[PDB]
Amino acid sequence: NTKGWSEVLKGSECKPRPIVVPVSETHPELTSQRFNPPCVTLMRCGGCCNDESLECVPTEEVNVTMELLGASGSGSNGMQRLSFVEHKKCDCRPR
Amino acid sequence: DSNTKGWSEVLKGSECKPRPIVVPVSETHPELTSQRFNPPCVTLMRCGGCCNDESLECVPTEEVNVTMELLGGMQRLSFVEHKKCDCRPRFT
Ligand SMILES: *[C@@H]1O[C@H](CO)[C@@H](O)[C@H](O)[C@H]1NC(C)=O
Numbered sequence: 001n002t003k004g005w006s007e008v009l010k011g012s013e014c015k016p017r018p019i020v021v022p023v024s025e026t027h028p029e030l031t032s033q034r035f036n037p038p039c040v041t042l043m044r045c046g047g048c049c050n051d052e053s054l055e056c057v058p059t060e061e062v063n064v065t066m067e068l069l070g071a072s073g074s075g076s077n078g079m080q081r082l083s084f085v086e087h088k089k090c091d092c093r094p095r
Numbered sequence: 096d097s098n099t100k101g102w103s104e105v106l107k108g109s110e111c112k113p114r115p116i117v118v119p120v121s122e123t124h125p126e127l128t129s130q131r132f133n134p135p136c137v138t139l140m141r142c143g144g145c146c147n148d149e150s151l152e153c154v155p156t157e158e159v160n161v162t163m164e165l166l167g168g169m170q171r172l173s174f175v176e177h178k179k180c181d182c183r184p185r186f187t
């Protein structure tokens with residue numbers, strides 16, 4: 001059935017939301033290597049602000065460590081614990 | 096550290112599966128862009144994640160309509176959501 005307006009609004013608000021991001025882009029300094037999985041889900045600020053002059057931006061972040069399959073010291077396949085920025089709070093702030 | 100995601104959780108979060116994504120209303124219904132909506136966007140379930148093999152793409156294998164109320168008075172707009180996904184050979 002139909003989603004009511006309150007539910008629709010709550011689903012479009014500026015808040016942290018999961019987003020799939022390429023791991024290489026989160027760690028550009030780890031060059032000449034591949035990551036498995038090559039993508040991760042990170043909590044990032046997302047949604048719509050009620051005004052064209054506002055953007056949905058983080059007001060609180062956190063670092064989280066994820067174990068991925070990447071490269072070892074020899075460039076072989078090996079596990080890597082890497083750190084990622086997640087957003088914990090967000091706000092509609094002027095540009 | 097209490098905030099450490101392990102191998103399995105990492106793999107699970109990478110899956111080709113339906114994921115919530117924010118979509119602007121004006122780029123879904125291009126027949127009503129002469130109007131602003133409150134809210135100006137919606138969350139739709141859409142397929143994403145990444146496949147084991149670069150020659151495959153994460154595509155929807157099941158699709159359903161969802162209706163939502165939005166302020167113009169109040170209007171019902173219909174959207175397509177993805178309920179199932181699969182990695183399929185890339186289309187040429
Ligand atoms: C994450 O840790 C780094 C230390 O390198 C720090 O600079 C950053 O502010 C931390 N994030 C928060 C807000 O916890």
Ligand SMILES: [Cl-]
Nearest residue numbers: 145151152153
């Ligand atoms: Cl793709």
